[PDB]
Amino acid sequence: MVPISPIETVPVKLKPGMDGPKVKQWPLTEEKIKALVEICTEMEKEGKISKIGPENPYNTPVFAIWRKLVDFRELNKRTQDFWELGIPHPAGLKKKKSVTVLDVGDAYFSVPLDEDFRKYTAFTIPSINNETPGIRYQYNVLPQGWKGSPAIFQSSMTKILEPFAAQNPDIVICQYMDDLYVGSDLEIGQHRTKIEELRQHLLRWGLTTPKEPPFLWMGYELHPDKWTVQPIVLPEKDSWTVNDIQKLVGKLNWASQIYPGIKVRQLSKLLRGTKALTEIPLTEEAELELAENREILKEPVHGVYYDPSKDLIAEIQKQGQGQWTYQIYQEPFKNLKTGKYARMRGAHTNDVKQLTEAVQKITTESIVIWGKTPKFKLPIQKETWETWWTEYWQATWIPEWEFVNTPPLVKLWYQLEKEPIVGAETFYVDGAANRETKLGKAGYVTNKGRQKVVPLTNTTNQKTELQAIYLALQDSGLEVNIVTDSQYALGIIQAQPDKSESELVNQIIEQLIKKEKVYLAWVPAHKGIGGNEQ
């Protein structure tokens, strides 16, 4: 016998204040008992387990479905924490002339367990009628379902594959759980030769190896020249529940990585605060969303693989209602992948901020996938971004980008003057409201003698302060100076929203858009400043 290479074990300790689990055994039928006896006998003949003496006080339950199902639940609650998360995305994979899949078999059982920890993996097989002591075993290798088995196996597989990878730089090896994916641009005969060399090198340590394209891997379809997602099954039910909507949203989100134009806003709004598995009709906008998405998922869509010699490009389009979509590609009409971004939950916002957030998301996702920031094509003029970031009170930045003219274009709808306006009428505005009766007033006075006060019902101090500004915008010319004491209203307008969840703010914005020059000044209230006619 040629001795297989030794594999050093990884020391394992249980969490502090805990000791080996001593869980009793559940009653099993005689068929289960005999099957477990035969299985454990074969495993012991192979060296995976060993019969143990009664000194070992630690035990773990075990069932049978034949297949043995040892339950290490309490042992996992007592075992320490280990390292290791995300899966490799197909769009980041680099086109190779040959790709081989090798599935390691008896993988965990190939790696030995720490000898000072085997005593805590013991289990008892219940004898027939419990007239005898139960058969006792301990695991000598990595058990199935254990907390530490995946990390220890991964570390061992890496330490074994390292010399072969270093000696063969002309091939690239990806390691994922119990599978190895070897890609190379060599000739097919040289490729198969290096595969045989690899599985021989793995056999030296005692690892057994045996699929062909297309590869069904982690919900993806991996073809030699393209990649896509596995067929998505969108259920059709006249009656929907919250668990159903959540599952439908997740499937739509998954399909959105390659299918462009997927929208999930309307369906996501339905599951707001339910937190209940059983409960929902579809609004007219939502039925379109599911029908739009059903139309999008009707036609085949494939993505390509990544070429490092070509530039990385991401183009962004505005969808409306706070929804954004982007496509990441290198050559025209051949996308590496797609995606979407939904605006954060807020009362006020504008297009430029949302576009910036989308750029940040695409940038982070790009650094994860391809390890580099892509060039951007954005539906915004250079002048618009220039004026925006130069006058924005916050520091903001977008990486290298260029303007693509695909409407709708992101623009600045209004801009406040930095200095008062000569020849423009000066509207001193003010509003107030009673706290108990919810009654209030909003009005303005001007330098030319123009005045107005409007009675208001079911309003607040903030609503009246906004209403006063709205009145001043309504009755003024193309150029207007406005004085207010509301820090609230000034704080809203200085955030420069183009849309709001408040109808009054939206109307104020619509009035601002129609204006030429608007100067919005602020003064302290109740200081006796004239014109501030509270």
Partner 1 sequence: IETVPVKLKPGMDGPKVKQWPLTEEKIKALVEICTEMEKEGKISKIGPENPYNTPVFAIKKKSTKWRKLVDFRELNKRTQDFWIPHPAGLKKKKSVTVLDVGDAYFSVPLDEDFRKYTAFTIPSINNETPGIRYQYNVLPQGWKGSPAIFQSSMTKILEPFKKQNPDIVIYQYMDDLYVGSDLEIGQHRTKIEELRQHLLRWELHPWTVQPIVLPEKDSWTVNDIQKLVGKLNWASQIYPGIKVRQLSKLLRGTKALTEVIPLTEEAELELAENREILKEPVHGVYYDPSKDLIAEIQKQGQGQWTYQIYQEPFKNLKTGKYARMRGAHTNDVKQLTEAVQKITTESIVIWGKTPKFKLPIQKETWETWWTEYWQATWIPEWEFVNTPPLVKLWYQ
Nearer to partner 1, 42 or 391 (CB): 391
Using the rule CB under 6 A, give the single segment among 66-74, 95-103, 154-162, 283-291 that binds ligand 7N1. Answer: 95-103
The two structure tokens encoding residue 420: 């008062």
Nearer to ligand 7N1, 99 or 424 (CB): 99
> Does residue 86 belong to the site contacting partner 1 (CB under 8 A)?
yes
Distance of CA 219 to the CA centre of its chain: 16
> Does residue 258 belong to the site contacting ligand 7N1 (CB under 6 A)?
no
Q: Looking at the chain, after which residues does the C atom sit over 2.5 Å from the next written N, breaking the chain?
A: 65, 84, 210, 279
Candidate residues 101, 249, 288, 432; the one interacting with ligand 7N1 per rule CB under 6 A:
101
Residue 271 interacts with which of partner 1, ligand 7N1, none, CB < 5 to 8 Å by class: none
* DSSP code, position 128: G
CA distances (Å), origin 165, targets 177, 200, 387: 17, 14, 52
Burial string for 30-44 (b: 16+ CB within 10 Å, else e) reads: eebbebbeebbeebe
The number of CA neighbours under 13 Å toward the Cβ of 143 is 28
Give the shortest CB-306-to-ligand 7N1 separation in angstroms: 8
Contact 165, 154 (CB under 8 A): no
Three-state secondary structure of 302-330: CECCECCCCCCEEEEEEEECCEEEEEEEE
Candidate residues 391, 402, 510, 516; the one interacting with partner 1 per rule CB under 8 A:
391
Give the shortest CB-177-to-ligand 7N1 separation in angstroms: 11
> Does residue 205 belong to the site contacting partner 1 (CB under 8 A)?
no
Residue 81 annotated as lining a ligand binding site: no
Per CB under 6 A, which of residues 302..321 are in contact with ligand 7N1? 305
Candidate residues 30, 55, 84, 225; the one interacting with partner 1 per rule CB under 8 A:
84
For residue 399, whether the previous peptide bond is cis, meaning omega lies within 30 degrees of 0, is: no
> Does residue 12 belong to the site contacting partner 1 (CB under 8 A)?
yes
Residue 179 annotated as lining a ligand binding site: yes
Candidate residues 17, 27, 239, 397; the one interacting with partner 1 per rule CB under 8 A:
397
Determine the length of the chain.
534
Contact 293, 262 (CB under 8 A): yes
Task: Give the residue at shortest CB distance from ligand 7N1.
Answer: 183
Residue 383's identity, in one-letter code, is E
> Does residue 195 belong to the site contacting ligand 7N1 (CB under 6 A)?
no
Per CB under 8 A, which of residues 412..451 are in contact with partner 1? 420-422, 425-426, 428, 445-447
Candidate residues 18, 23, 150, 183; the one interacting with ligand 7N1 per rule CB under 6 A:
183
Q: 3-state class of 496 per DSSP?
A: coil
Residue 106 annotated as lining a ligand binding site: no
Classify residue 388 as exposed, middle or buried by CB count within 10 Å of its CB (0-12, 13-18, 19+): buried
Candidate residues 189, 235, 281, 528; the one interacting with partner 1 per rule CB under 8 A:
528
Give the shortest CB-224-to-ligand 7N1 separation in angstroms: 4
Give the shortest CB-249-to-partner 1 separation in angstroms: 23
Contact 43, 37 (CB under 8 A): no
Residue 286 interacts with which of ligand 7N1, partner 1, none, CB < 5 to 8 Å by class: none
Residue 178 annotated as lining a ligand binding site: yes
Nearer to ligand 7N1, 310 or 438 (CB): 310
Give the shortest CB-338-to-partner 1 separation in angstroms: 17
Residue count, binding to ligand 7N1 (CB under 6 A): 17
Contact 206, 5 (CB under 8 A): yes
Place of tokens 């072969």: 164
Angle, in degrees to the nearest 10, between helices 503-513 and 461-474 = 20
The two structure tokens encoding residue 280: 């929902």
Nearer to partner 1, 12 or 270 (CB): 12
Candidate residues 490, 502, 504, 506; the one interacting with partner 1 per rule CB under 8 A:
490
> Using CA atoms, how far apart are residues 505 and 492, in angstroms rounded to an integer?
9
Give the shortest CB-179-to-partner 1 separation in angstroms: 13
Residues 6 or more apart in contact with residue 469 via CB below 8 angstroms? 429, 482, 484, 486, 489, 493, 508, 520
> Does residue 394 belong to the site contacting partner 1 (CB under 8 A)?
yes
> Does residue 215 belong to the site contacting ligand 7N1 (CB under 6 A)?
yes
For residue 408, whether the previous peptide bond is cis, meaning omega lies within 30 degrees of 0, is: yes
Which residues contact ligand 7N1 (rule: CB under 6 A)? 88, 93-96, 99, 101, 172, 174, 181, 183, 213, 215, 217, 222, 224, 305
Residues in binding site for Mg(2+)? 103, 178-179, 430, 465, 485
